[PDB]
Amino acid sequence: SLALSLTADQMVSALLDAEPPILYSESEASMMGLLTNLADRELVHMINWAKRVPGFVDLTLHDQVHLLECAWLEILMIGLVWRSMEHPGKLLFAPNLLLDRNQGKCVEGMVEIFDMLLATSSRFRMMNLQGEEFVCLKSIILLNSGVYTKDHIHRVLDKITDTLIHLMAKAGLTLQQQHQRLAQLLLILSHIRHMSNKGMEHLYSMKCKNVVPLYGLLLEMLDAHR
Amino acid sequence: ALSLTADQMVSALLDAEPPILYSEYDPTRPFSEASMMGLLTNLADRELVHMINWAKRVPGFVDLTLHDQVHLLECAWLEILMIGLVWRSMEHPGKLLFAPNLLLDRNQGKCVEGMVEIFDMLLATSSRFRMMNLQGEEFVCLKSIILLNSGVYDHIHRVLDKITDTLIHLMAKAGLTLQQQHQRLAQLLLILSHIRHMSNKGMEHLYSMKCKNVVPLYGLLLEMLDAHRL
Amino acid sequence: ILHRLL
Amino acid sequence: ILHRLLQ
Ligand SMILES: C[C@]12CC[C@@H]3c4ccc(O)cc4CC[C@H]3[C@@H]1CC[C@@H]2O
Ligand SMILES: C[C@]12CC[C@@H]3c4ccc(O)cc4CC[C@H]3[C@@H]1CC[C@@H]2O
C-alpha cells in the first residue's frame, strides 16, 4: 500500500496534483438554480479527486461511497472558503459568480449560512492559510468525517498530520508554533462540519418548498443524509 | 489565565469538573417515548446549571463580556453534555451511562423515535475514546476547547493556544515521542468534528420532540434549544 | 435566563 | 449514481 510509504513531499505533490478544476456558473429561484447547478457539476470532479487522494482507492467500494456521502458538502464549502480568501466580504462560488454578503438575502435562510462561510474565509486569511495546508485539510475531511460511522484510514490520517507538520517545520515555525497551528487548523474543521449540517437542512428545505428542483447526483447525496 | 503554566492549567480544569448527577428514573413503570425523553431532558436541565458554574471556572472565560459568554454556552452546551456522556460511558462497552441509575443500551434508544441513530454515534465515540485510551487530563482539555471554540466564528485564541500547549505537555510527560504527540493531538481534535455533528443531529432531534409535544421543555433548556433558531 | 445565571 | 461513478 504505497500510500503509507510516501514522503511528506510526495504526499503534498500527490494532493496538489489531484486538485479539481475551478468551474464556472452561468430571484430566489434563479440564485438557488445557479448554486445547485454548480454544486452538481463540481460533485462529479470531487469523485475523481477523491480517487486520487492517496489511500482512498485502497478502501472497499462501500466505504468509499460512505465517506463521500458524509463529506461532500464539507468538501464543497472548504473549497468555496479557500477560493474566497482574497475577497474579503465576498464568496467566490465561481470566477464569474462572486457574491457579496447581502446577496445572501435574495434566498430565504441563506444569509446566516453566508455569514458563517465569510467568517471562515476571514479566519483562513488571518492565519495566512497556505495552498499546501489547504489540500491536506481537504483530504482530512474526506477521510475523517464518516470514519466513525478503519485502521488503514487512521494510518493514512496520521501521514497527513505528518505532512501538515512537515510544511510548518519547513516554513520555520518553532515546535510550539507548529503544534499550536496544527490545532488552529483542525479546530476549523469543527466549524466546517457545523456549516455542512446547517447547509444540508437548508438545501432540504429549498427542495421541500419547491424553490429549486434537484436532480441526479446532488439529489442522491442529499438523500444520503436522510 | 495566559500566565498559568501547563500544570496550573490542568489543576484548574480538574478542579472545575462538575458532579455526576442522578436521573429521576422510576423503575416501577415501563418506559414510553414520553417518559424516556422526560428523564433525559430533566437530567440535561439540571446539568446545565452545573455547566454554567464550570464555564465560569474555565481560565479566560470570565474575561469575556456577558454577551460573549452567553453566545459560547449557547453554541456549545449540547456538545459539552455529549462529551461528558461519552467520557462517563467509556468503561461500559455498548451502553450509555446517562446517570449511575440510568445506563441505556442501543435497544433502549429505540424507545424514542429517531434516537437510536444518535445512540449509535455516541456509542461509536465512546469506543474511539476507549481504543485511544483517553485520559482524564486530556478529556478536561477537550471539554474546554469545545466551550471556547464552538461559537468563536483574539483573547479566546490565546487561551486556546495555551490549552494546546497543555495537551502537548501532558503527552510529553506521559512519554509519547515528538511524532506521537502531534499524531495524538490531531486524533483528539478530529473527534471534535464528530461531536459537533452529533450535537447538530441531537439538537434537531430535541426540536422535533418539542414540536410534536412529546415532552415539555421549560426554562434554561428551552432557551438554550431556542438559541439555535432551528 | 442564561444571561441572568451568568 | 455515486456507486457507478466510483465504479
Ligand atoms: C447547499 C447550498 C447550495 C450550494 C452551495 C454551494 C455550491 C457550490 C460550492 O462550490 C459550494 C457551495 C457551498 C454552499 C452551498 C449551499 C449551502 C446552502 C445551500 O442550499
Ligand atoms: C438532546 C437529547 C436529550 C438529552 C440527551 C442528554 C442528556 C444528559 C446528558 O448528560 C447527555 C445527553 C446527550 C444526548 C441528549 C439527547 C440527544 C437527542 C435528544 O433529544
Author numbering:
A (entry chain B): 305 to 330, 338 to 460, 472 to 548
B (entry chain A): 307 to 459, 473 to 549
C (entry chain C): 689 to 694
D (entry chain D): 689 to 695
Quote the study's own text.
The estrogen receptor α (ERα) is a ligand-activated nuclear hormone receptor and a major regulator of cell growth, survival, and metastasis in a large fraction of breast cancers. Structurally, ERα LBD is an α-helical bundle, with the C-terminal helix, H12, functioning as a key structural component of the activating function-2 (AF-2) cleft that governs the agonist or antagonist state of the receptor. The Y537S and D538G mutations are especially interesting because they occur at the N-terminus of Helix 12 (H12) in the ERα ligand-binding domain (LBD). Importantly, breast cancer cell-based studies revealed that the Y537S and D538G mutations conferred hormone-independent activation of ERα and reduced the inhibitory potency and efficacy of clinically prescribed SERMs and SERDs.
